[PDB]
A paper describes a structure:
The vertebrate Nav channel is composed of an ∼250-kDa α subunit, which contains the ion-selective pore, together with ∼40-kDa β subunits that modulate the voltage sensitivity, gating kinetics, and trafficking of the channel. The Nav β subunits (β1 to β4) are related to the L1 family of cell adhesion molecules and are thought to possess a single extracellular V-type Ig domain, connected via a stalk to an α-helical transmembrane domain and an intracellular carboxyl-terminal region (4–6). The Ig domain contacts the Nav α subunit and modulates its gating properties. Here, we report the crystal structure of the human β3 subunit immunoglobulin (Ig) domain, a functionally important component of Nav channels in neurons and cardiomyocytes.
The structure was determined to a resolution of 2.5 Å, with phases obtained using the molecular replacement method. The β3 Ig domain assembled as a trimer in the asymmetric unit. The β3 subunit protomers in the asymmetric unit are related to each other by a pseudo 3-fold NCS axis. The total buried surface area within the trimer is around 2565 Å2. Potential N-linked glycosylation sites of each protomer point away from the trimer interface. Key features common to all Ig domains are present in the protomer. These include a buried disulfide bond (Cys-21–96) that stabilizes adjacent faces of the molecule and the presence of Ig domain-typical β-sheets. Instead, the region is held in place by a surface intramolecular disulfide bond, Cys-2–24. An intramolecular salt bridge between Glu-4 and Arg-115 further constrains the local conformation of the peptide chain. As a result, the side chains of residues Val-3, Val-5, and Pro-6 are surface-exposed. These residues from each protomer provide the main trimer-stabilizing hydrophobic contacts.
Author numbering: 1 to 27, 32 to 102, 110 to 124
The structure:
């Protein structure tokens, strides 16, 4: 069955990081938006599912990898090759029609070694 599990919030520099986002659903059109915000900055979109997985232009374009389910209850993504600079707040927005909308916040912090 579908369990809602929070994402890890600590990442090791140089490894891939899974930004977990799970929205267990009510027995359906889906939109998923992933946002990132650097310390002292503004949210910008980095990943989108909106009638398909869209190419989103961002500093993240190139290092993102989809890691979710086909049923779209798991909408996790992976950031490849993590740097100290990827620290910040990641937001996962999942909306569902035929209405719902759920938000998940990931205060991501990257470490050495």
């Amino acid at each position: 069955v579908c369990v809602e599990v929070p994402s890890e919030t600590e990442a090791v520099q140089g490894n891939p990081m899974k930004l977990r986002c799970i929205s267990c659903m009510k027995r359906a059109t889906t939109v998923v938006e992933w946002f990132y915000r650097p310390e002292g900055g503004k949210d910008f979109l980095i990943y989108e599912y909106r009638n398909g997985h869209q190419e989103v232009e961002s500093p993240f374009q190139g290092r993102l990898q989809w890691n979710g389910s086909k049923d779209l209850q798991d909408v996790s993504i992976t950031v490849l090759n993590v740097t100290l600079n990827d620290s910040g707040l990641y937001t996962c927005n999942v909306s569902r029609e035929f209405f719902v909308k759920t938000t998940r916040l990931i205060p991501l912090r990257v470490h050495h070694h």
